[PDB]
Amino acid sequence: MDIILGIRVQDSVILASSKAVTRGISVLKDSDDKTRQLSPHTLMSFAGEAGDTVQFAEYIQANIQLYSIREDYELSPQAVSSFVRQELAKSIRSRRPYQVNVLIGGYDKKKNKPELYQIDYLGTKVELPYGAHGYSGFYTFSLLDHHYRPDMTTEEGLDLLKLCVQELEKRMPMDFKGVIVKIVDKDGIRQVDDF
Amino acid sequence: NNYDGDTVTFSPTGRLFQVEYALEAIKQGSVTVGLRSNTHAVLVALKRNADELSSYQKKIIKCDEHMGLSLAGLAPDARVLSNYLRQQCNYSSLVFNRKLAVERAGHLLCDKAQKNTQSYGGRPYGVGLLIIGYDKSGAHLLEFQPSGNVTELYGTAIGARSQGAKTYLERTLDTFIKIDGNPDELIKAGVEAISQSLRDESLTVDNLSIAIVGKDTPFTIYDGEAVAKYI
Amino acid sequence: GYDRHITIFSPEGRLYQVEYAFKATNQTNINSLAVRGKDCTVVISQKKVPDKLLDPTTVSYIFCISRTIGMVVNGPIPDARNAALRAKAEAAEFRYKYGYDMPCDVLAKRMANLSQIYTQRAYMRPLGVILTFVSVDEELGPSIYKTDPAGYYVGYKATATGPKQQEITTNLENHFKKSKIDHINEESWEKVVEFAITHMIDALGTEFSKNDLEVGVATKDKFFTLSAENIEERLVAIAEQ
Amino acid sequence: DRGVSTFSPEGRLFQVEYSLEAIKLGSTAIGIATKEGVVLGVEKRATSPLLESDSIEKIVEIDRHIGCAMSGLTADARSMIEHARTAAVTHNLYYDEDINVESLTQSVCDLALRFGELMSRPFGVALLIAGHDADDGYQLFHAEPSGTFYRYNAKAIGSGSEGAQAELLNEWHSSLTLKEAELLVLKILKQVMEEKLDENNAQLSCITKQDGFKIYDNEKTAELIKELKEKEAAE
Amino acid sequence: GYDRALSIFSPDGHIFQVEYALEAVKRGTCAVGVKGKNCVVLGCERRSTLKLQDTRITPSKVSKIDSHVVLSFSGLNADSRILIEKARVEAQSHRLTLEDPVTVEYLTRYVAGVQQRYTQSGGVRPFGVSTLIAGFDPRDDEPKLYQTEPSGIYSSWSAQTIGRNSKTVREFLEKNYDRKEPPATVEECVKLTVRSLLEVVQTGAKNIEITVVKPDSDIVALSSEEINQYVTQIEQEKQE
Amino acid sequence: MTDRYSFSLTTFSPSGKLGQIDYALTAVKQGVTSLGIKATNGVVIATEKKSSSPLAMSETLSKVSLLTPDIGAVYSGMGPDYRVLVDKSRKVAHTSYKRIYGEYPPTKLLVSEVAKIMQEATQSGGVRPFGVSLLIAGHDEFNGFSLYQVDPSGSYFPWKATAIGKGSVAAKTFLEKRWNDELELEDAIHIALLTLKESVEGEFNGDTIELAIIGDENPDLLGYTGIPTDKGPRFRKLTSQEINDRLEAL
Amino acid sequence: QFNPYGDNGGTILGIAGEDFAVLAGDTRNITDYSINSRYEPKVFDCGDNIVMSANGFAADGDALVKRFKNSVKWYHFDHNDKKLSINSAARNIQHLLYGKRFFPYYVHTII
Amino acid sequence: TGYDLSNSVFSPDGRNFQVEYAVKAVENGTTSIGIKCNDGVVFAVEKLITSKLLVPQKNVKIQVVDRHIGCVYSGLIPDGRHLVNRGREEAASFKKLYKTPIPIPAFADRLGQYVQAHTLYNSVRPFGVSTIFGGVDKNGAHLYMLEPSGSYWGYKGAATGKGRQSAKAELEKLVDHHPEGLSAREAVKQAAKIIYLAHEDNKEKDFELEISWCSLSETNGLHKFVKGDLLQEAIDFAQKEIN
Amino acid sequence: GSRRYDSRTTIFSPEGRLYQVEYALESISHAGTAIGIMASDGIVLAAERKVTSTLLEQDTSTEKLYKLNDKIAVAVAGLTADAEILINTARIHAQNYLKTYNEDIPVEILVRRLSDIKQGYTQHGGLRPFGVSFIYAGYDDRYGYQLYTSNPSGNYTGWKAISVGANTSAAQTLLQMDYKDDMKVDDAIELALKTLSKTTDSSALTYDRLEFATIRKGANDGEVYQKIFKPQEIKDILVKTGIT
Ligand SMILES: [Cl-]
Ligand SMILES: [Mg+2]
């Protein structure tokens, strides 16, 4: 899969993810949701090799949902990211590694703080105010570096995200058929249906 | 008594009681007769029904085109041992393009049964087999006991009241051995032999099971109206 | 009372299956003796061929483990040969791995450690044998090391094993109490064998023909067993003084 | 103690003979094979009136052309049914055809004596395997924990078996209709059942070539029970 | 590995280890299940022999297998945890492969299957546990209540009890529960469940736990005071 | 074949007793007396070389064994069980410590590893417990000098001074009267010889007594010079002569 | 490097009539530009009124025909001497072939 | 007591009662013998004709190992076959690694260690056979007899089964009367006589004589069965001696 | 074969009890009394060493109170050797969780893991169970201060105050009498020592016969400190509370 962006603002995390699924010559789908809800206040967007992406995302989802039931408790975004990193770090020295890059956007209900974690397929984890995977960062980061403030509202975050998507639509050779945008806050996960 | 708890224990007189108890299961089983000439070998088996609604338990199993046996005792054990014979007959044909000698088939059954009598956890086979076959040395009849003892005979019988049929064959020995190139007369001698082991009941059309293998005769089982000719 | 059937502790803190294995040791009714010279270690053992149908050359309780190590066994021949084959395998493997000949006392300890395992593990029975290992070790010199079903082993100046071990032991004890040395002060192994046979005759109070004895001799860099004619020469020398 | 695979002095496997005693304590199951189809009927025997009786599943589909009724420790049957279903589907995958009722029964009976010190004990349940194939037509088999299977024109297993089997002895003939068989199973179940037979404590099923294996609705069985009562009052 | 056949048949055709596993259930604290018209209630006895107990952290008797299914039990507490874990794993495994949460019947059939397996597997003893599995099938408003036992047999119940003095509370439910008209509301269903336990419990204090499961993953555990109000109202009507 | 004893041979009796451990302790009680005394500047472990025969060379039988350069062990009970425990103790000191941390284990942790091996023989399938009690004396940089007892159960306790086996009850009473927290190593050896004389019937000399100390570093016993930090082993087995010298000042 | 495969040439032809079927094949076996045999039978009677030929790598061909003939024999044993229908034989051969999906038989099979 | 219920359990005597019970099965078996001649060995066995229905010369009891070793046994026939099957594996693996056919003393220990191994554990039963075996190797002729305990020795003559006392007495006479040795053809004749004499302990049923031999001169050091004229000559000699 | 000698450690009695579990509990009933008392501002662990000697080196000795991590400690009652096997397993399980989730293991998750191991030895394997009862004193940021106990059955329960080992009947009655919910650590220290002093089979309770530990938020600000009391510190608290 292609472009996955993330931006952590004042009180929420916003994950933008392309809708295009291309198999070589033809664009098979233009409405693909490249994200899974791991827990009520933790969302994970993913991009990488065909099949491995969904297989990994669903496997993590199943494990976090199992923990949630066993302990009757939601793991902190930090705890979920640490679990995901270990699975990818384990994966890279396997017979056939998961070729999957993920952004984990979560709202920590204990600390009342949004948290964005960027983890590549090697198991390289970093906590960031804004992150991306593949070539998405090359086009967008120069805009985010300029405009980003830690005290930004969700609406300002979406406006800065639109400027990022516009720059991608201008200078990227590939048509990624726009993005599905999702917000993670204290009230949980909701999808922006107009973008 | 104290030495019949498992197959791994000798008695003070050097007996294996679990093997002797397995041998007893054969005596409870329905009578089956084996006899051969120089050209043909015949199995005759009295099949046993549960009641009048039930079918008559099949006694004869085909192992190859040139070999097969009849059983007396635990039928599931006969299925295990016959399946093993089928495989060994098959292995010989595929690997060596060679029909498995009846004598060698006996040696293989003996060795398979023996392992169950010397090892803890396992149990002896609870069935006796009469193996007939025609190979490169003519017609053959074998008697298999789950003790491991396999014996090559002209004729024999195993099961309940088998002694009656075994005495008859011991008298008729000189006659039935000479029935060469006459399958019908050899079966007649086998049907007359198993008749010496009957009490109260007689040989009906769904009661009697006959098999024959010979010089130009593949191992074929006769049941139903096919054996009405011999009643 | 299943504490008498397998190797677990009785209320007294005893292993009865070990104690009964010691009793199996004397089933052959054979007495062995081992003594040390200056340059050699000699082991003698009674040879009894009761059946005339037996090939007497094949009746032996002395084993050539390695070139350097010899082993006499007190106990039944099946367990003796079980122990013999293992000792040979252990001695060969040692040389391959560590690049020098397995010492007598190290093999004794190894076979004793194996014997110990049988006294602790239930599925394995003890071997009903006492193993007397002899060599001229390249470091320690003349060496006698004896193993038993308990897994006990120790070095000896001299030793005796069998039904009449005590009579032989006391006879040897009395000699070493006089001489006040840990060995037979003799140059040739031939005379150390003559000493061994003489002191067994004195202890048991029985005379021996060439076919009644079995002799093993350890020298530097080889252990070997004497033929009936080599023993006969030994018996002649004893009788002529 | 003593081996699980031990023979008695009479030449019988103790554990197999003891499992047969457990099957005698089981609820009654009856099968009747006709030229129009095979009928399978069971006593449900609910331990309490609060137990929803339609959740008692003692008649089970193996394939479209093979049904199965059980009596004894019914929990033990689940792994036997699973194997039977797998065997039936697996053969269809390998040979693009339905499996012979005898071949299916033989496959189930191969599990029976796979116990020792494999599973730790024999199965504590007997099965009536009823079906149809092109070769041998409508068939009813009795699969025991001994690994032996007999083909029957009619068979009763469970607590009321010997009383029911004596009744089946008199009643069965080679010219029975499917409707006659249905009433006959209902008649003999009602005879041997402790509680009074209705559509909630008893269940009917059949296997026909056309429609395959079908478990009867409580409404359909209720009508056949009412048809039985009237024809018994008729003389 | 340890292969010893512990669960075997006796001459009278009984598996004593399975029957002795039921005797462990008989000892266990009383659990009761009552399904209304649009809810299921799981009542559970807490023996008051243990006070100075921390009720915040002490393992609760009713366990969530998924967001829509619950499992209560009577018998060995340690044994129950192994069945609950296996069930919770199978619940997530079903969601992952079928892309649909387990039916209450399927989850029951699985747990019952595990219990059965332990009655003819070598070197293992049966579970000293009977379970009440309650909930609602996905996108279904029909209440579901199932019972399992060490033998591995399972069945659906309009109302059922397990554990010590379960004979007495089943006696109560059999005369008090009408099938044609089940407890229409949550109140009526909880009341009938508390009433059934009060036949056996002793004091209606911290000895009764009540968990109400409603359709669409709506599960809540009643507090001491909420249950205490039911206990109060029942005995004030009884004084007549 | 196969080890078909995959079940515990040590089980709880109705009274709550583990029979095979109690019987193992009975076997230890029958064993020859061994003792240990801890001084301010060293530890001493001693036992009687009960020679089975006067023909036997009792020097070849080592009752007091080096486990590491700074740790020594003595026993009471079944000699063979002790010998295989010393072999396992020496190896586990390398495999589970030295090959990881590049240094020998501290006394308490090696004791813990030996204890674990003896515990497993008490629970594992188809084995009896070890019929020995061990007295392990040792020194390490951060814990200093220490003395530990290990029982067939796998239970271990640290001691200032103690005795195990035949005359342990009488010996422990003797040590209680003599022991103080100001003893020098020579004073502890003197008390060790006095205590051990009571439980010995026959000959009492350097040839019938086995005695070792955990004391000062022995650079003479290191076998190489040139590395200042390597100063040699603290474990030293006293010679037949060294014992006899201290039996004149007895 | 060792090449486990070879080409033994040959050509086979199967034609289905209204109430009959023919399976024909040349009797020439070759490697490269050499003739191995002028008469090496390639089409085989497998019993149950089924004829079969596996053309390409003769070793893999003989192996497959042999294993199918064996499958017919065991079908008789397991299913009360029932005749193996051509459609059943076909599905059986698919499983024999796909069984070595990752080390295939270099043969084009016609029955 | 209870020491005799389990294999590999030492009685207070120091005895393995289960092995001693295995010997009772051997003593119950038919008579089998072995005679060591000048340049080889001769094996003979008593085959009890239970019934007329037994096909003569078909139920062969003596077994060959490799091409140069003969094996005969008394007691549980299946146990004997199991031991020979192991012997053939031992002889094959030896030849595979060392090229030369297994020497008889080497082969004797291979059987010996295997039979002894079945007295070490309660999970296996001891062998219910005494096995008389041997043949010709590079060091000449060798005859051995192996007991359930795993005990074996070299023999001049060997006998086991029900008529072993009778046989042994006859073997002892041959050893005394022939110190220079016995010829291969003489040993076949004497073997026939001894089985006929030892048949007095099994006199109820009539029997069938079976003889085999390995001889450097007569069989080129290979194991062969005594057949046709040479067998009839030995039967005639035997029948003449009993009358 | 081997079956003859098998005790069958994992079977039910006719009454539906686990023989070996019941007999293991009988074993533990003779072990030194261990008490845990949970207060609002910390937890106390008090335990009695069994009939000691004057020559036992007490300052380097540990038979009762063990550290699982920086937040969780256990008091032992039963076979010390059996406990150390489980303790080492628990310590690893705590570090495995910390490595995976980069957060300290919640107390109940550790307790359940150890309890599930104990359960296994009662259902399969044919081995004897662990003759050990634990008192788990721990803190996490979900439930705060928590007391638990596990026994050889593998059953665990939460407590405000609890005893294991000898004279638990007498001990639990004395705790149930004098415990209150608003109690503080200093008060809980006094109760624990007073309970042991009355239930002890010894003539008098002295410092050399006691192991003592506290888990306090009495750690400078928003963190938790474990304190394994030294022999001199146990002697001081015995004089302070007025027992010696
Ligand atoms: Cl070793
Ligand atoms: Mg043992």
Residue numbers in the entry:
A (entry chain J): 1 to 195
B (entry chain E): 3 to 233
C (entry chain G): 2 to 242
D (entry chain D): 1 to 117, 125 to 242
E (entry chain C): 1 to 240
F (entry chain A): 1 to 250
G (entry chain L): 1 to 111
H (entry chain F): 2 to 244
Provide text from the study.
The ubiquitin-proteasome system responsible for degrading misfolded and malfunctioning proteins in eukaryotes plays an essential role in cell-cycle regulation and apoptosis. The proteasome 20S core particle, the catalytic core of the system, is assembled from four stacked heptameric rings adopting an α1–7β1–7β1–7α1–7 stoichiometry. The active-site nucleophile of each proteolytic centre is an N-terminal threonine (Thr1) located at subunits β1 (caspase-like activity), β2 (trypsin-like activity) and β5 (chymotrypsin-like (ChT-L) activity). Natural products featuring a β-lactone moiety, such as omuralide, belactosins and cystargolides, have been proven to suppress the proteolytic activity of the core particle. Their uniform mode of proteasome inhibition relies on opening of the β-lactone and transesterification upon nucleophilic attack by the catalytic N-terminal threonine (Thr1Oγ).
Indeed, 1 inhibits the yeast 20S proteasome with a half-maximum inhibitory concentration (IC50) value of 6.2 µM for the β5 subunit, whereas it has low binding affinities for β1 (625 µM) and β2 (60 µM). The electron density map displayed 1 covalently bound to Thr1Oγ of all active sites due to the high ligand concentrations used for crystal soaking. However, because 1 lacks strong interactions with protein residues in the caspase- and trypsin-like binding channels, the 2FO–FC map for the ligand is diffuse at β1 and β2. By contrast, 1 is well defined in the β5 subunit. Superposition of 1 with known complex structures reveals a similar conformation as observed for the class of belactosins51,54. The acyl-oxygen atom of 1 derived from β-lactone ring-opening is stabilized by the oxyanion hole (Gly47NH), whereas the generated hydroxyl group is hydrogen-bonded to the carbonyl oxygen of residue 19. Similar to NH6 in belactosin products, the carboxylate group of 1 interacts with the threonine N terminus and displaces the nucleophilic water molecule, thereby preventing hydrolysis of the acyl enzyme complex, and explaining its inhibitory effect. Furthermore, the isopropyl moiety of 1 at the P1 site is stabilized by Ala20, Met45 and Ala49 in the ChT-L channel. Therefore, 1 could be an XP universal virulence factor against insects, as well as soil-living food competitors like protozoa, that disturbs the ubiquitin-proteasome system and thereby causes cell-cycle disturbance and immunodeficiency.
